[PDB]
Amino acid sequence: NALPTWWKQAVFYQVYPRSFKDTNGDGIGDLNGIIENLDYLKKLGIDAIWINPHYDSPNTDNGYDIRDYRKIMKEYGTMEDFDRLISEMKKRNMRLMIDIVINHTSDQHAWFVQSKSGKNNPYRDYYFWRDGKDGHAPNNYPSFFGGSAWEKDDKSGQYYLHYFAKQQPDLNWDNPKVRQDLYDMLRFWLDKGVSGLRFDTVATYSKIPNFPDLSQQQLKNFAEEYTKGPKIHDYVNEMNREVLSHYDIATAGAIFGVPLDKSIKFFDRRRNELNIAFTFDLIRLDRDADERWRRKDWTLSQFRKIVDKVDQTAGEYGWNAFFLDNHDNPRAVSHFGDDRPQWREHAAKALATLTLTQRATPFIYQGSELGMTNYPFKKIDDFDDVEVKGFWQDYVETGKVKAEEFLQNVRQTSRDNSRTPFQWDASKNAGFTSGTPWLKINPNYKEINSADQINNPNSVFNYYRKLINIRHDIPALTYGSYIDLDPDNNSVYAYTRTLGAEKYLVVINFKEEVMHYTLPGDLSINKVITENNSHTIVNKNDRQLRLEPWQSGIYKLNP
Numbered sequence: 001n002a003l004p005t006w007w008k009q010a011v012f013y014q015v016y017p018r019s020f021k022d023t024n025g026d027g028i029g030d031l032n033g034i035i036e037n038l039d040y041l042k043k044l045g046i047d048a049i050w051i052n053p054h055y056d057s058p059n060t061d062n063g064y065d066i067r068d069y070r071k072i073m074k075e076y077g078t079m080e081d082f083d084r085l086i087s088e089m090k091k092r093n094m095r096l097m098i099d100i101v102i103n104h105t106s107d108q109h110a111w112f113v114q115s116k117s118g119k120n121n122p123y124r125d126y127y128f129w130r131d132g133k134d135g136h137a138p139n140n141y142p143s144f145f146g147g148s149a150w151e152k153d154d155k156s157g158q159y160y161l162h163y164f165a166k167q168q169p170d171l172n173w174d175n176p177k178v179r180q181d182l183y184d185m186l187r188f189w190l191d192k193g194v195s196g197l198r199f200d201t202v203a204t205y206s207k208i209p210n211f212p213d214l215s216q217q218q219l220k221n222f223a224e225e226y227t228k229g230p231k232i233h234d235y236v237n238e239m240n241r242e243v244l245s246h247y248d249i250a251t252a253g254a255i256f257g258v259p260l261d262k263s264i265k266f267f268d269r270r271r272n273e274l275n276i277a278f279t280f281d282l283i284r285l286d287r288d289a290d291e292r293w294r295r296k297d298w299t300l301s302q303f304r305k306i307v308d309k310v311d312q313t314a315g316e317y318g319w320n321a322f323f324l325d326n327h328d329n330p331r332a333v334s335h336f337g338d339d340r341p342q343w344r345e346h347a348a349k350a351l352a353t354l355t356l357t358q359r360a361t362p363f364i365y366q367g368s369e370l371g372m373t374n375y376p377f378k379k380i381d382d383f384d385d386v387e388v389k390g391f392w393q394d395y396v397e398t399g400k401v402k403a404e405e406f407l408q409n410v411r412q413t414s415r416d417n418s419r420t421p422f423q424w425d426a427s428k429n430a431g432f433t434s435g436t437p438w439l440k441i442n443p444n445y446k447e448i449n450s451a452d453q454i455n456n457p458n459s460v461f462n463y464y465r466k467l468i469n470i471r472h473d474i475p476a477l478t479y480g481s482y483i484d485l486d487p488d489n490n491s492v493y494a495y496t497r498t499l500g501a502e503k504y505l506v507v508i509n510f511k512e513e514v515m516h517y518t519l520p521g522d523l524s525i526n527k528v529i530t531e532n533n534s535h536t537i538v539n540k541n542d543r544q545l546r547l548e549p550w551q552s553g554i555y556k557l558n559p
């Protein structure tokens with residue numbers, strides 16, 4: 001059985017508007033630059049776009065600190081430009097998903113300005129205010145973005161809670177007036193015909209009664225602890241009943257911190273919470289849990305075991321998104337592939353094949369369709385991201401970690417790796433801007449750009465385009481069940497996707513040498529659906545493949 005829906009079979013593209021296309025020379029991407037490139041996305045074969053936050057914001061965290069939920073960000077343009085994006089997407093039969101950030105607002109949001117003015121203001125209980133303990137913060141809560149999660153306010157003498165930047169105070173979801181105002185805000189956007197919502201850090205809305213201290217253990221994985229609020233599902237379901245279920249939308253929940261065996265409660269269709277799981281297990285598989293900027297070695301067997309556990313967790317009643325990178329993570333070809341010149345294009349096509357053959361809604365992050373890479377940051381000042389400055393302050397300026405070792409890691413792990421501007425063409429600043437880009441463009445744009453790829457049939461771009469057409473053509477590549485042929489193999493990633501008699505095999509050689517790979521049991525090849533970097537022909541009934549380094553392919557198997 002399988003309830004098909006548009007959002008299960010969609011291929012989404014994620015646009016980070018600050019870095020997509022600048023159309024007025026200020027160095028920052030804008031709405032009009034999205035509009036201008038919709039035919040490019042339609043040619044790739046995308047039918048839905050998720051945009052990162054597009055609201056009025058002081059940009060401490062690039063739109064995730066929202067100062068007014070009902071205004072367009074000044075740098076992105078006007079409400080008129082927003083409504084044109086919708087209307088021009090509609091002309092092209094594309095659906096828009098927006099980013100809903102209601103764990104916290106900017107400290108400049110009118111609600112916070114009132115709340116901080118004193119204990120008597122009607123907005124006081126819109127945020128979390130607590131007394132110090134012996135002239136220190138109410139408790140030992142750390143922030144994701146550095147220091148304590150409590151900021152002293154001199155006006156009142158009390159501390160306010162901020163899991164993120166001190167300019168992102170957390171909204172008090174235990175206050176029913178807060179939830180009702182957020183619901184009116186959602187209806188403002190949903191009434192404009194938006195087709196999807198992504199809920200940013202949806203699992204942290206419910207705070208822990210009485211705010212007790214975290215134990216030593218809990219301090220080393222506090223992200224998980226902040227997901228343990230006792231009313232989180234009451235609140236998500238109430239939001240579904242009062243708002244989400246009255247419109248026709250797909251909702252995605254970004255559940256950072258949630259242990260994978262707690263994820264299903266958010267997405268089981270019978271629970272009437274959200275539709276699509278954004279889990280972080282796979283994309284953070286190689287990240288230290290205590291020093292969250294540090295990476296550690298990982299293996300293909302580790303990777304594929306997580307793919308399979310995420311897949312099984314969704315089970316019959318949930319549904320996964322699948323992504324290998326996004327605006328919070330290094331670029332996939334650098335992170336999971338080999339980004340050197342001899343291999344980058346083969347590895348990028350290998351990972352596209354993986355992505356576009358998962359039992360999940362795939363999300364392609366802008367630039368990945370070109371094989372864009374991490375950026376060669378050298379000095380701490382080459383980064384923009386508030387998060388990396390928080391890590392530098394906590395670990396390097398306290399003398400706990402040498403600056404150079406810190407940099408060797410954040411070069412690989414920083415969010416700013418995925419925020420360098422999109423490489424449109426080979427002209428100055430890769431045609432992203434007529435001015436000076438807000439974050440420097442990778443010098444590899446001369447070799448990696450959309451103009452060089454869009455009409456080259458062998459390009460990474462056109463291999464993504466071919467895979468998307470393949471996936472739409474073959475229902476088993478969307479709905480088929482997933483079986484990993486060998487979860488312990490560290491060289492060749494091979495799995496099947498099966499619907500009844502229709503059985504397909506995906507095979508990717510993660511090694512930089514030729515690998516021979518004999519199929520298990522009685523499996524043999526009926527057809528080749530596509531391959532990249534193939535040298536040995538595959539004939540009817542072949543039971544073995546000779547895989548070139550970085551070779552990837554999809555095959556139909558004999559019954």
Ligand SMILES: OC[C@H]1O[C@H](O)[C@H](O)[C@@H](O)[C@@H]1O
Pocket residue numbers: 061064101164199200201202254256327328
């Ligand atoms: O969902 C988690 C979100 O948390 C914060 O508000 C981040 O800065 C953002 O990039 C991330 O996606």
Ligand SMILES: [Ca+2]
Pocket residue numbers: 021022023024025026027028029030075
């Ligand atoms: Ca601009």
